[PDB]
Design a protein around this ligand. Sequence first.
Ligand SMILES: *[C@@H]1O[C@H](CO)[C@@H](O[C@@H]2O[C@H](CO)[C@@H](O[C@@H]3O[C@H](CO)[C@@H](O)[C@H](O)[C@@H]3O[C@@H]3OC[C@@H](O)[C@H](O)[C@H]3O)[C@H](O)[C@H]2NC(C)=O)[C@H](O[C@@H]2O[C@@H](C)[C@@H](O)[C@@H](O)[C@@H]2O)[C@H]1NC(C)=O
Ligand SMILES: *[C@@H]1O[C@H](CO)[C@@H](O[C@@H]2O[C@H](CO)[C@@H](O)[C@H](O)[C@H]2NC(C)=O)[C@H](O)[C@H]1NC(C)=O
Ligand code: NAG
Lengths: 261, 247
Amino acid sequence: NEQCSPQQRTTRISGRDGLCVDVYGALTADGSRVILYPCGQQQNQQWTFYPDNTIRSLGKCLATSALSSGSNVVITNCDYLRYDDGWMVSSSGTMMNKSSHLVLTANAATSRTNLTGENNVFAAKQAWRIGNYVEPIVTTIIGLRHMCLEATDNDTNVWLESCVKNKTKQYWALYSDDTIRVNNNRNLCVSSSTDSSSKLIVIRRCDGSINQRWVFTPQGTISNPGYEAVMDVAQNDVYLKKIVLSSATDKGNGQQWTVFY
Amino acid sequence: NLSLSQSNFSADTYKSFIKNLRKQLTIGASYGSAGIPILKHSVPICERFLLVDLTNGDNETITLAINVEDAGFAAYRAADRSYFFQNAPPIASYVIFTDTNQNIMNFNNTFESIEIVGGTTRSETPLGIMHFEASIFHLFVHDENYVPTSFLVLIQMVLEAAKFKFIEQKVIHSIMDMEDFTPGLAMLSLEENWTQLSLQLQASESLNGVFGDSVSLYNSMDEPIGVDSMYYPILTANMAFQLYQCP
Ligand SMILES: *[C@@H]1O[C@H](CO)[C@@H](O[C@@H]2O[C@H](CO)[C@@H](O[C@@H]3O[C@H](CO)[C@@H](O)[C@H](O)[C@@H]3O[C@@H]3OC[C@@H](O)[C@H](O)[C@H]3O)[C@H](O)[C@H]2NC(C)=O)[C@H](O[C@@H]2O[C@@H](C)[C@@H](O)[C@@H](O)[C@@H]2O)[C@H]1NC(C)=O
Ligand SMILES: *[C@@H]1O[C@H](CO)[C@@H](O[C@@H]2O[C@H](CO)[C@@H](O)[C@H](O)[C@H]2NC(C)=O)[C@H](O)[C@H]1NC(C)=O
Ligand SMILES: *[C@@H]1O[C@H](CO)[C@@H](O)[C@H](O)[C@H]1NC(C)=O
């Protein structure tokens, strides 16, 4: 069964604010920089994956340009990497250079931001969706007592309410940077607490942070991988109107969620 | 035997049943990068079947044999009778329901086969609590007019729900809202592609989680979403287990 060993696939790579990984001006010279840019069909956003762990556009290979963090990610001649182990993409969408452990990062959100190799902190700005479908995925999010997450208090808070099909504030847009956004206001992201004294999950202006990176795991949790915790209904009591970040526990169903899209 | 009764069919009990069905199917499952259990394969025929009891609104009970390799129905029992799909493994009748009057159904356990024989499609076959109930009845008495649509109902509400949290949730919505439904493109595209998603996910191991082919999954707005990798929550948080496909 050779379908088990596909030799290549050409796709796109989207990330922060739903922008795409783009070879700037489609330049082919070694060290030509990779940027963040609005997603389209152009060849310089077409990335081909191969079993040698290379990722390629315009015939050349995505690559870090330094051992230390802070420098641009570039495309360069693939023969320069013949003895390199290449890239490793985690199950959560972190794209990592195997040797250096540097991670594809977008330090700003605006079109033309240079992508760089950075130390991994599991920020939303270090989360990517490899795939051709780059749009935010619109969904409801079902939790304890078959209830739906709703954006509340002028899109500042979030808790469970009974699912109502029409109700616009129960819809969420799932972005390529692992953010969960208010569907009607896509500058607003579900956020773990910035106040040390509180575990309360809230809604705040999207800023690319660890607080806003979320992973829908196959075991049915909503994980914040940088804080090694999951979304949880406080006291397994939906009436408390509080969702919190907790370490994974088999004790309650408050950590179980469903994506209904 | 794991069981579900129309008498006690609340969103909670339905959910527990599906959760336990998945649990049991995935005993001894293998795992890849994606973290989605891959069902067992090359199982000795004596171990290949999981039995599940379904009871309708009036204490009529059937027992379904599920093949643990593919989460499909091979056969079922009603009282001292049993019924085997034509494509059930040929040795199955020596292993399950041995002390019954065994019979062969003249169609396969696939949607394509069941749809042709019954003259009706999943898109026109309602799902919900009352349809579950009546389906159990028609299987119990083996009324041949209704056997194919009864299987469309029960395969979708039991097995396909076990495969996909999306489908499980469609049934929960149906219980909570007290409203039957017909499956739309979203549900059907999952059902249609379970096998292909299985293959691609396993094959993706050698391409950093990227698929060899794209699979189209529809959302509730009938928009198609191309899934050409494991980095789609609508796959990775939905498909609860896979068919074994790759070494
Ligand atoms: C994203 O990445 C690109 C590429 O790295 C940025 O551009 C580059 O910026 C350098 C300075 O950051 C340019 O250097 C100047 O080059 C002339 C000769 O090229 C040299 O005589 C100058 O002194 C200066 O060079 C450096 O001086 C400081 C030293 O520490 C350093 O070692 C020298 O190299 C360089 O040409 C340029 N590269 C290219 C191909 O464009 C880019 O920055 C934006 O554009 C540049 C031109 C400049 O306006 C920057 O300040 C500005 O950030 C960066 N950001 C964006 C959004 O594109
Ligand atoms: C991953 O990172 C490593 C290390 O930063 C890169 O390996 C270096 O490649 C440069 C350019 O060819 C060589 O001069 C160095 O000798 C290598 N350093 C080490 C420590 O081996 C590698 O190019 C990166 N790979 C990708 C695809 O980004
Ligand atoms: C039933 O499925 C088998 C595969 O085992 C196939 O060969 C046969 O042609 C199918 N027949 C029907 C009735 O569709």
